[PDB]
Amino acid sequence: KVFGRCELAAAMKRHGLDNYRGYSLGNWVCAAKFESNFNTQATNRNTDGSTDYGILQINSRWWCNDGRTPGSRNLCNIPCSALLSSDITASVNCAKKIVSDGNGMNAWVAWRNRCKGTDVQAWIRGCRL
Numbered sequence: 858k859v860f861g862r863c864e865l866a867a868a869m870k871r872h873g874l875d876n877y878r879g880y881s882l883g884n885w886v887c888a889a890k891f892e893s894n895f896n897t898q899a900t901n902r903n904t905d906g907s908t909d910y911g912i913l914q915i916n917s918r919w920w921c922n923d924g925r926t927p928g929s930r931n932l933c934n935i936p937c938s939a940l941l942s943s944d945i946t947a948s949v950n951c952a953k954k955i956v957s958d959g960n961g962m963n964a965w966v967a968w969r970n971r972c973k974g975t976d977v978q979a980w981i982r983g984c985r986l
């Protein structure tokens with residue numbers, strides 16, 4: 858599923874991401890924009906053999922099981938395919954664990970390089986929230 862900008866913001870808010878760990882909703886929408894272009898089915902293979910999955914490009918070395926990332930963990934206790942569903946519940950619940958891990962949203966490279974320090978509120982402007 859390719860979410861609309863305001864449609865994703867509303868779904869993230871209902872699932873409790875707005876202000877989670879102090880990160881306003883615009884940070885999460887911006888992160889999803891540059892990680893996946895709002896596409897829940899996005900996948901990208903990394904040089905280490907791991908793969909990033911879903912709207913927030915969650916990595917199989919630490920967070921989910923894809924059966925092909927040797928020596929990896931599954932800290933969200935989910936198959937990586939669960940991060941590709943049109944229902945973003947699994948991605949949100951796993952992102953909550955990631956953002957609590959110590960480095961905050963710096964775990965998302967696209968967020969650090971393209972959202973952090975910018976006017977992230979623009980990503981929810983015009984949305985009925």
Ligand SMILES: O=C(O)c1c(Br)c(Br)c(C(=O)O)c(Br)c1Br
Nearest residue numbers: 933934935946947948950951954
């Ligand atoms: O906080 C957790 O341990 C957790 C995570 Br991580 C995920 Br992913 C899911 C899910 O949507 O599958 C659920 Br339910 C829970 Br509880």
